Write a new protein. Structure first.
Length: 116
C-alpha cells in the first residue's frame, strides 16, 4: 500500500523508522515514556495525552503541553510481519528530528529493561 523504505526517514516533520520489537510492547513502552515524563515539555512537565488507541495492528497517541498548545507530540504505529513495528513521531507543527531520535532510544531502553 506504501512505497518501500529502508532505514530512517524524515519528511514534513515526521520521523519514521522501523523497530524490530513486538507491536504491543512498543505501544506500552511509548505510553510509559510519555506518562512518566521520560520525554518532557519546555517547562519540564510530562505531555498531556488527549487520545491513545490501539487495535493490535494500528495505534496512535496524541499529546500536548499544558502550558503551550503548540508544544505537541504525536506518535503513530503500524504492525509489520515478523514482529516488527513501523513508527512515526512528530514533535510540534514543524517536527524535531533530534528529539524524535531520542524518543526512539528511550522506547528501546524501556523494552529491553522491562520499564513498561
Amino acid at each position: 500500500h506504501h512505497h518501500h523504505i529502508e532505514g530512517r526517514q524524515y519528511k514534513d516533520g515526521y520521523y519514521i523508522t522501523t523497530l524490530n520489537y513486538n507491536f504491543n510492547t512498543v505501544y506500552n513502552a511509548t505510553l510509559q515514556a510519555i506518562q512518566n515524563g521520560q520525554t518532557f515539555d519546555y517547562k519540564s512537565n510530562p505531555y498531556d495525552i488527549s487520545v491513545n488507541k490501539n487495535n493490535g495492528t494500528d495505534a496512535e497517541i496524541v499529546s500536548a503541553s499544558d502550558s503551550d498548545s503548540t508544544d505537541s507530540l504525536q506518535v503513530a504505529m503500524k504492525k509489520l510481519p515478523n514482529n516488527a513495528t513501523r513508527i512515526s513521531i512528530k514533535y510540534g507543527s514543524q517536527g524535531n528530528s533530534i528529539r524524535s531520535s531520542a524518543l526512539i532510544g528511550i522506547i528501546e531502553g524501556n523494552i529491553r529493561y522491562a520499564n513498561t
